[PDB]
Design a protein around this ligand. Structure first.
Ligand SMILES: [Mg+2]
Lengths: 158, 190, 107, 51, 42, 59, 79, 245, 51, 258
RNA sequence: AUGGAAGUCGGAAUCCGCUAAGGACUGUGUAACAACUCACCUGCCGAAUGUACUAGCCCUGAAAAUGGAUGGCGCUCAAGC
């Protein structure tokens, strides 16, 4: 009757995420093909993106969920063309994302953020966007963050 | 630059008797008596307070002022030795050939003797004679452990060093051959 | 034995029980040892040692200056010449060496 | 039992792919881990593929 | 008893003090006043 | 071409990136592309090796 | 080294007349040559040397600076 | 002095703070004083204090300062002439040792109830008295050291074996497993990490943290608060008994 | 150094060559039939060389 | 390592083509909405311009890919402009004229197929026909003894000209990549080459401070053009053939006429 | 990007929150994690220190080959400077 939580990284719309799982979920009594197809069904929203999946295991069945991360949300909001990960490598995420979508991602990530305010959450998402390498409103995310801190850009409260 | 006056202090426990004459220090406690000649260092000993030994140097250089700290630590370790004692635990570990350690006490000399056999299968018997005042026992609580106790910290540590030095692996890769007798713990008897 | 057998031996059996303490103490004695080598070596070995120490001191100072300054081609060339190894490139009709040591016929 | 993490169809496909290397050699397919799952526990058509 | 660990394992070593052989020549208040005067002069 | 093949290969892949603690080489360079080509190549390699051994034994 | 138990041939501190004379001649020649490179030295030299100033640990540097400023004011008033 | 310990230069990003940190702390406290109705002084003595992050997250509408004690005392003002607000210098008598400021607009009864109900297990620091005797059983050493049953436990990592020997257990590496004595628990008694009633030292607390054994608890004790409207300081139960300066 | 630590394989003697996907029991079989010290672990590519 | 597509009227980026591991040293835009890129990661890529997705990845070269050329570059640079010196009245017929010029330049066996040639530092070239061959090269062009700097098709599509660092310009058949003749006479690395509109003549500008006009049918040095005091970096021949422009390290534009 | 790569095999960026402070990490470690450690911060303590240069005197800064030379004994708060 015990509950085990296993967190993993997976690519959406893929079956081979259970390749590493079957060494350890096998003693637990789970079916690797079943949990792989079930993970793919959960991550069918997030094609081509590395996402974090939580597995809740009780009485030898597993329930899957997708834990939202800032990097996955930003790369999904970038709206990149569909690509083959086997043939098209060394890609760069150099498109642009709007500041409204940045605030929406921050509202999504409020459940993880320890910041006091949505402005702090937005600045965290802007830093993650700067790491990813995209643009916000055609400018640098660092420049947008500096504008937010200096007061030119106003973030709505909650 | 010569410093006019420099002072150190050594507190003395209630059960310890310390006698200094001509820079020859004798410290007696519940566990026995230790003696050390400190005539190689110029120092004025005094009783600055009840239960405090004062050390002074007059018109000394920085090196002369610095030697008082060594004298302080030496006399303090003698006091600790006659009060609580010193105990070094050694562990002998082996891969294939079990190390056989035999401890005897020589009635003629009064010292302990440690005999080491079958070190990496060698047919020689290694013999180490302890310094006087050092007692050696084989521990029954743990496996393959010697215990060296005494009042003199220098004697106990040098005896442990002798046992560590005599079992040395030669002409082998020490990443592979891990055999030896090693000091595993240092502390007080009490 | 085969492949990384000493690493496997370290993983299965560890090392000698005093290895960490001996390594720490030797590293701690390195300062006294370096000064002793500077003051006690003789001859060509001492000279090579001193030149090597001079080189390491210079490189350390350069690295220190770079870490201090962490928080702060020349000639126009076309695109097909970019990222290549290009040379640095820096009346009286006099030669660069107008006078040399004269050579006698006996020499 | 596919506790290695790979599909048995993929294992059969790998064997079929490397069969041209097996000329002039003898081949024994060892089905491992019978303490977990037996060959009789398989569905009929995959048994037919292995035979 | 001792609560902290000594790095070299000689746990009987006492809690030593800093080696300042010129200790006690100048007080703290006088040095503060001299600090202010030297800062003004600089 | 052959007077510069060696320098060209070293410029493409330095010695430190090929083998060593900081090596980044993952896919090898192969003279074959398919499994059937590999089997045929192994057959010709074994035949040539035996031919060289017989020539050296004769010499 | 095994210097104490087996010392080597000693390095003599007794000078010879030939070496003393040669060293004296070489020192005189070096002095003259240094004078020659000094008289044809093309290196720039300042007209006024960089004066070190007053030490900080001098206790009366502040009143000496007061004296300097007062002397400047008096000289400006006189001129 | 030619003979000298050589100082190592740190080739890392973070530099020393200096006086700018002190001025920033002063300005932050002096600008957060007028915005809040109450200022509580709390103490966390001989505690790991990493749960103050969770306390800060839970009390998002408050402001917690956990800086230097003397700097916070000078920021509040220790004398009536230098105080920022009327009656703050009565509050500064509680600032000794490991203290923190809590500026809030909530009811003080709510704060007292929250910090009375706040309970969290914690690793003991050196100087605490051990509530129970802990003994690692002989044989194969497991990750928890015998707190959970071994069949639910996992064997301890082989990289901790030099560390455990340094902290004083005679453990050994038998075929890739850390064992106390023999693999079948022979020729060795269990290792007593601590005994009940014994004052723990840092070696024992380090062993307990390595074996994930929590022998202490985290508790924030409120000493007293100052209200901006009344301009007076109310003494609480911990502040009645704690020494003051 | 790598060549010095290579295993010695005679290409023209009696030899049993074990192949397959990872995590199927190749190292377990070789340990069970020989004296070779090849590691057996549940993760893929435990064995990265020829033993 | 990126190619950005810009909308000229607004100045914003529509697509970012990424995937190269080295600097994209040359980009071309064909008449079928394909973008061809060569890079320092030894690769030549064909991208879909409308979608921004990679279509082909050719990895045959052994060093830096310095330059790529298309069989239709001469008509794609000029669109509807030609020898008549008159422009059609409206945009639709102007686009039709440009498209029919491109298709006339790009027909191979009655089908529109753009040929691509890539010159590299591995002393060689590769000839690609992505429509009919895919990733299989038509030919490898061998013969330069040093790095190949510039490559260009002739306007009539029969010849390929190559400038190399071995002081030579070489001519190749544009259909099967077969070597024809060597143009010898420069004494320093030849940096650029440029065709005349009638495909009789190629002018090459080199590091030896000279331009040389070569008759490719005779295979000889037609004209020698000295006058630059330093290296010649940029060479162009006008589409109507009236002028040749050269520029380089001596900071002055030089124009050359018959 | 990698079979794997979670600060720590690599390439490029290197921002924000919470801050008292904590690098998109200084090293040890793992197959990868974990674990430890450093930078930085707080508490205990208690008053002067740290860095680099300059000047003296001392050591090293290259030596062969019979046994030898501050002229010799010898000299160490000098019988040296
Ligand atoms: Mg495995």
């Amino acid at each position: 009757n015990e509950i085990k939580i296993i967190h993993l990284r997976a690519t959406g719309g893929e079956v081979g995420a259970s390749s590493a799982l079957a060494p350890k979920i096998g003693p637990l009594g789970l079916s690797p093909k079943k949990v792989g197809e079930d993970i793919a069904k959960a991550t069918a929203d997030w094609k081509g993106l590395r996402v974090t999946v939580r597995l809740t295991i009780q009485n030898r069945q597993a329930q899957v969920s997708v834990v939202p991360t800032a990097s996955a949300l930003i790369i999904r909001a970038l709206k990149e063309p569909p690509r083959d990960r086997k043939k098209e490598k060394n890609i760069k995420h150099n498109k642009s994302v709007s500041l409204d979508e940045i605030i929406e991602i921050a509202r999504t990530m409020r459940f993880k953020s320890f910041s006091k305010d949505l402005k702090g959450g937005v600045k965290e998402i802007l830093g993650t966007a700067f790491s990813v390498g995209c643009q916000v409103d055609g400018k640098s995310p660092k420049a947008i963050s500096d504008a937010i801190e200096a007061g030119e850009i106003d973030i709505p409260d909650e | 630059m010569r410093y006019i006056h420099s002072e150190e202090t050594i507190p003395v426990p209630e059960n310890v008797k310390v006698s200094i004459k001509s820079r020859l220090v004798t410290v007696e406690g519940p566990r026995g008596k230790l003696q050390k000649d400190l005539s190689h260092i110029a120092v004025n000993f005094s009783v600055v307070k009840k239960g405090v030994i004062g050390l002074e140097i007059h018109h000394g250089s920085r090196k002369d002022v610095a030697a008082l700290r060594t004298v302080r630590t030496i006399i303090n370790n003698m006091i600790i030795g006659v009060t609580k004692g010193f105990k070094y635990k050694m562990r002998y570990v082996y891969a294939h050939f079990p190390i056989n350690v035999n401890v005897e006490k020589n009635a003629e000399t009064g010292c302990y003797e440690v005999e080491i056999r079958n070190f990496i299968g060698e047919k020689i018997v290694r013999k180490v004679v302890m310094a006087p005042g050092v007692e050696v026992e084989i521990s029954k609580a743990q496996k393959d452990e010697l215990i060296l106790s005494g009042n003199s910290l220098e004697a106990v540590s040098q005896s442990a060093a002798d046992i560590q030095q005599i079992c040395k692996v030669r002409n082998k890769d020490i990443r592979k051959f891990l055999d030896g007798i090693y000091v595993s713990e240092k502390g007080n008897i009490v | 034995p085969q492949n990384e057998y000493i690493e496997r031996h370290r993983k299965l059996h560890g090392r000698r029980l005093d290895a960490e303490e001996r390594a720490r103490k030797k590293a701690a004695r390195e300062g006294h040892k370096n000064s002793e080598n500077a003051q006690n070596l003789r001859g060509l070995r001492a000279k090579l040692y001193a030149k090597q120490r001079h080189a390491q001191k210079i490189q350390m100072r350069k690295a220190i200056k770079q870490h201090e300054e962490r928080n702060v081609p020349s000639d126009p060339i076309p695109s097909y010449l970019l990222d290549r190894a290009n040379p640095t490139t820096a009346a009286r009709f006099s030669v660069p060496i107008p006078k040399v040591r004269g050579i006698s016929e006996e020499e | 039992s596919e506790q290695c993490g790979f599909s048995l169809k993929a294992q059969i496909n790998l064997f079929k792919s490397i069969k041209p290397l097996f000329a002039n050699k003898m081949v024994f397919i060892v089905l491992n881990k019978m303490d977990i799952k037996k060959f009789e526990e398989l569905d009929p058509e995959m048994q037919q593929e292995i035979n | 008893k001792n609560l902290g660990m000594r790095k070299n394992g000689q746990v009987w070593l006492p809690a030593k003090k800093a080696f300042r052989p010129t200790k006690g020549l100048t007080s703290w208040e006088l040095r503060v006043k001299k600090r202010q005067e030297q800062a003004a002069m600089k | 071409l052959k007077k510069h093949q060696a320098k060209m290969t070293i410029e493409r892949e330095p010695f430190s990136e090929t083998f060593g603690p900081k090596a980044q080489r993952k896919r090898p360079k192969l003279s074959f592309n398919t499994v059937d080509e590999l089997a045929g190549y192994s057959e010709q390699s074994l035949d040539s090796y035996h031919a060289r051994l017989e020539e050296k034994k004769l010499l | 080294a095994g210097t104490i138990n087996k010392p080597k041939k000693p390095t003599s501190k007794r000078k010879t007349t030939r070496l003393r004379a040669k060293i004296s001649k070489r020192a005189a020649e070096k002095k003259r040559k240094e004078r020659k490179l000094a008289r044809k030295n093309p290196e720039w030299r300042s007209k006024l040397k960089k004066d070190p100033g007053i030490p900080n640990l001098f206790p009366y540097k502040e009143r000496l600076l007061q004296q300097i400023e007062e002397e400047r004011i008096r000289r400006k008033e006189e001129l | 002095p030619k003979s000298k310990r050589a100082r190592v230069y740190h080739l890392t990003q973070v530099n020393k703070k200096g006086r700018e940190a002190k001025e920033r702390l002063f300005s932050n406290i002096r600008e957060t004083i007028p915005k809040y109705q109450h200022c509580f002084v709390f103490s966390v003595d001989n505690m790991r204090n990493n749960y103050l992050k969770d306390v800060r997250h839970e009390l998002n509408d408050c402001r917690i300062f956990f800086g230097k004690t003397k700097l916070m005392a000078r920021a509040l003002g220790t004398t009536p002439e230098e105080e920022q607000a009327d009656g703050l210098h009565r509050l500064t008598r509680y600032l000794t040792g490991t203290v923190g400021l809590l500026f809030t607009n909530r009811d003080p009864a709510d704060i007292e109830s929250y910090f009375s109900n706040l309970s969290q297990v914690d690793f003991a620091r050196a100087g605490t008295v051990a509530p129970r005797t802990v003994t690692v059983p002989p044989g194969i050493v497991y990750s928890t050291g015998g707190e959970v049953p071994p069949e639910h436990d996992v064997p301890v990592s082989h990289t901790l074996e030099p560390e455990l020997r340094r902290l004083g257990m005679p453990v050994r590496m038998i075929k890739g497993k850390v064992c106390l004595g023999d693999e079948k628990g022979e020729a060795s008694e269990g290792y007593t990490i601590c005994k009940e009633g014994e004052v723990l030292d840092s070696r024992q607390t380090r062993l307990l943290k390595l074996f994930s054994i929590c022998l202490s608890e985290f508790k924030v004790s409120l000493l007293g608060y100052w209200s901006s409207a009344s301009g007076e300081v109310t003494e609480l139960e911990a502040g009645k008994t704690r020494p003051k300066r | 150094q790598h060549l010095a630590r290579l295993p010695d394989i005679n290409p023209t003697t009696r030899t049993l060559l074990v192949a397959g996907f990872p995590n199927v029991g190749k190292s377990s079989f070789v340990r069970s039939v020989t004296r070779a010290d090849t590691p057996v672990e549940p993760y893929a590519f435990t064995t990265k060389s020829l033993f | 390592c990126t190619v950005r597509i810009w909308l000229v009227n607004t100045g914003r980026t529509e697509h970012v083509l990424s995937g190269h591991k080295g600097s994209v040293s040359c980009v071309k835009w064909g008449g079928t909405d394909l973008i061809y890129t060569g890079s320092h990661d030894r690769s030549v890529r064909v991208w879909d311009a409308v979608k921004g997705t990679l279509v082909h990845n050719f990895t045959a070269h052994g060093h830096w890919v310095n330059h790529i050329a298309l069989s239709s570059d001469h008509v794609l640079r000029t669109a509807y402009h030609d020898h008549t010196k008159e422009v059609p009245g409206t945009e639709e017929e102007r686009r039709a004229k440009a498209k029919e010029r491109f298709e006339k330049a790009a027909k191979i066996k009655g089908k529109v197929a753009e040929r691509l040639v890539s010159a590299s530092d591995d002393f060689t070239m590769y000839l690609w026909d992505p429509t009919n061959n895919g990733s299989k090269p038509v030919a490898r062009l061998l013969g330069h003894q040093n790095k190949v700097n510039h490559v260009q098709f002739s306007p009539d599509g029969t010849l390929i000209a190559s400038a190399g660092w071995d002081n030579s310009t070489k001519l190749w058949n544009a259909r099967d990549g077969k070597f024809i003749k060597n143009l010898r006479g420069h004494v320093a690395p030849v940096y650029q080459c440029a065709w005349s509109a009638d495909s009789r003549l190629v002018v090459t500008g080199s590091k030896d401070c000279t331009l040389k006009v070569w008759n490719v049918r005779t295979g000889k040095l037609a004209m020698d053009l000295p006058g630059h005091e330093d290296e010649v970096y940029a060479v162009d021949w006008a589409a109507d053939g009236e002028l040749v422009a050269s520029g380089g390290k001596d900071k002055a534009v030089r124009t050359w006429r018959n």
